[PDB]
């Protein structure tokens, strides 16, 4: 999809294998913000998006938190607390064509600004001078879009397919995880558990705390877990720390 | 916690249906006995130019669709009239059916995720509302309308609360923190009973009324054309 109408399909309820993406070499830029591209296989996200688009000409590096320009301010703006990865690679041999695939729009001018992670397909005529023009491209009223131009003659101006994976790992019970083979759970022993990304060490016991059908884990006064609803059985286990003390 | 709740002792608009604003969330409760209440409609303009949520409680299964519907002037659902000519929509959903029987509902749109809470109880008193669904719709909703004969509509507001979880993990009580001076004390001390004394809850501060700018009125335009658009650098 063109950058002014970037696609996005929310990925969930599946096993995410970021190994098949991290080791591939065709990707030109693989930059991750808030996460490391080598530790994506051991994490569990509540929802992972995939914003795919094509950005040729300049602004190949404007897809990043805290950047300005004609693309990052009028087409696709990322937040400042962005958590995810930004993958890019020039697709000159798929999105070029023998003549010109003038098929990608980029939305010049827009109005005054654009909020993060917002999209707008409205093609209403933009007026920079006087107001009178209503849906008519007049003297000082331009059609807002303006298409892209693709040809080898233009490296710093050839299309770069971009896929912006945006992970949100605090919004819900973790539904998309990495390729980690589950093991049997053992109770009454100090173990280093891993409940879909919830890493930690402790001794798991049976509990009497009657979880409600929607609650998935209990929490302490601090940001430490007290009880967990174990997957694959929906059982409520208590996490007590295995004994310690001075000597 | 600081979340969008219904402020205590707020004016709820008892209706007896026209479109209603869904500015940042909407409370909904109605006591019926034969399911005369039949669902909802959510959207921005409802003129097929944009997506719009729509819930209709079919006989046994609920229906949640986000399609560019064309709603009639008075859409109703026992004959349905609005659910026609829906084109290129991106969400469908089916689940268990919803609904002297007071049925409450809370509708919140948080970061494109449509959150629905509910509690059907047999309106003084208190009852915690457990969550039902979390719909990843990602659409803009500004108004809403119920699908039909007596329901209430309260609007949520970003006001922090002091939720009292019972020994069984259920919310038993709550303190509307910004309701009255006494309740703000209950957030400072983090308790539902405060002892005799004088507690400093917050700080009064007169807010500014006008923003005045006093720049020099020298109207000369700086020669940025003489340092950029020069002929010889």
């Amino acid at each position: 999809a063109s950058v002014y109408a970037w696609n996005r399909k929310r990925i969930s309820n599946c096993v995410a294998d970021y190994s098949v993406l991290y080791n591939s070499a065709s990707f030109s830029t693989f930059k991750c913000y808030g996460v490391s591209p080598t530790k994506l296989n051991d994490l569990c996200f509540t929802n992972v998006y995939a914003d795919s688009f094509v950005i040729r000409g300049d602004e190949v590096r404007q897809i990043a938190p805290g950047q300005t320009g004609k693309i990052a301010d009028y087409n696709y703006k990322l937040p400042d607390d962005f958590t995810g990865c930004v993958i890019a690679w020039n697709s000159n041999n798929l999105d070029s064509k023998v003549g010109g695939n003038y098929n990608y729009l980029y939305r010049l001018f827009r109005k005054s600004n654009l909020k993060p992670f917002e999209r707008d397909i409205s093609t209403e005529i933009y007026q920079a001078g006087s107001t009178p023009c209503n849906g008519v491209e007049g003297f000082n009223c331009y059609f807002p879009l303006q298409s892209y131009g693709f040809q080898p003659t233009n490296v710093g101006y050839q299309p770069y397919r971009v896929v912006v994976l945006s992970f949100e790992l605090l919004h819900a019970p973790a539904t998309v995880c990495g390729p980690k083979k589950s093991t049997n759970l053992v109770k009454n022993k100090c173990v280093n558990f891993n409940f879909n990304g919830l890493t930690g060490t402790g001794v798991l016991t049976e509990s009497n705390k009657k979880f409600l059908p929607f609650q998935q884990f209990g929490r302490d006064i601090a940001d430490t877990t007290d009880a967990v609803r174990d997957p694959q059985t929906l059982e409520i286990l208590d996490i007590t720390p295995c004994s310690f003390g001075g000597v | 916690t600081q979340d969008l709740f219904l402020p205590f002792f707020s004016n709820v608009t008892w209706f007896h249906n026209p479109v209603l604003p869904f500015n940042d969330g909407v409370y909904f409760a109605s006591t019926e006995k034969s399911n005369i209440i039949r669902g909802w409609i959510f959207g921005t303009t409802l003129d097929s130019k944009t997506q719009s949520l729509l819930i209709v409680n079919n006989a046994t299964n609920v229906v949640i669709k986000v399609c560019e519907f064309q709603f009639c002037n008075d859409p109703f659902l026992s004959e349905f009239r609005v659910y026609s000519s829906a084109n290129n929509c991106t969400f469908e959903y089916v689940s268990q059916p919803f609904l002297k029987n007071l049925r409450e509902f809370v509708f919140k749109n948080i970061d494109g995720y449509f959150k629905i809470y509910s509690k059907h109880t047999p309106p003084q008193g208190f009852s915690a509302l457990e969550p039902l669904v979390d719909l990843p719709i990602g659409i803009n909703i500004t108004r809403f309308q119920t699908l039909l004969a007596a329901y209430y509509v309260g609007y949520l507001q970003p006001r922090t609360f002091l939720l009292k979880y019972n020994e069984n993990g259920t919310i038993t009580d709550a303190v509307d923190c910004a309701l009255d001076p006494l309740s703000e004390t209950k957030c400072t001390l983090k308790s539902f009973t405060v002892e005799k004394g004088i507690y400093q809850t917050s700080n009064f501060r007169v807010q500014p009324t006008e923003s005045i700018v006093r720049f020099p009125n020298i109207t000369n335009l700086c020669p940025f054309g003489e340092v950029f658009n020069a002929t010889r650098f």
Partner: antibody
Amino acid sequence: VQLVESGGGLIQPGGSLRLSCAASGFTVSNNYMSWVRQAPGKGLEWVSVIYSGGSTYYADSVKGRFTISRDKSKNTLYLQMNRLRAEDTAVYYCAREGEVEGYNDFWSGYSRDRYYFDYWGQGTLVTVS
Amino acid sequence: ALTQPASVSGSPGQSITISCTGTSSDVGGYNYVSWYQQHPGKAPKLMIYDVSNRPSGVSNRFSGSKSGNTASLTISGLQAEDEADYYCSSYTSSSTRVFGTGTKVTVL
């Protein structure tokens, strides 16, 4: 930037003629496209202009008879001429307007206006008789 | 419309001015007056645009200006190649563009 034209030739009054202007190196939607004719051994008369999108603007001498169009897929500019007359005998040029930020005088930014004519087509003879 | 002198003449070395009078709608009101050069058998060439500016890649002797409803193309240092007709194209005043009658220059 290239602009090639075709479609002109001998034609009788009252008939129909459709002109073509294939544009390589740019699009019929990137910058304004305009048709301009020149009578044999005479001045230049602006025929019509289509903006980047949504404009069908013509001259009072060709209103209701000529319609300007384009094909984004083939990147060609078209000019229908219906009900031709003897005074339409001329060579027709398709002129691309000024691209946004022409020659980039680094003072003004991206305001499309830049109303002038960039490189032209080769021109095709239209003889109505 | 735009009126131009049907022809002007001069000797190499000196300067020549070229006038174009019009209404107050396009030339007198707006500021997008342009100038072109067309050799016999060739397509015209952008000589002046923005009615002050000159496109790069063009001899710097060319110069233009407009005083009210009248436009001016002040060519300086005529050479032998300058022999061609010059059309003054102002702005359009709501998308009905106009051109001058043409000034065929003849160099001595």
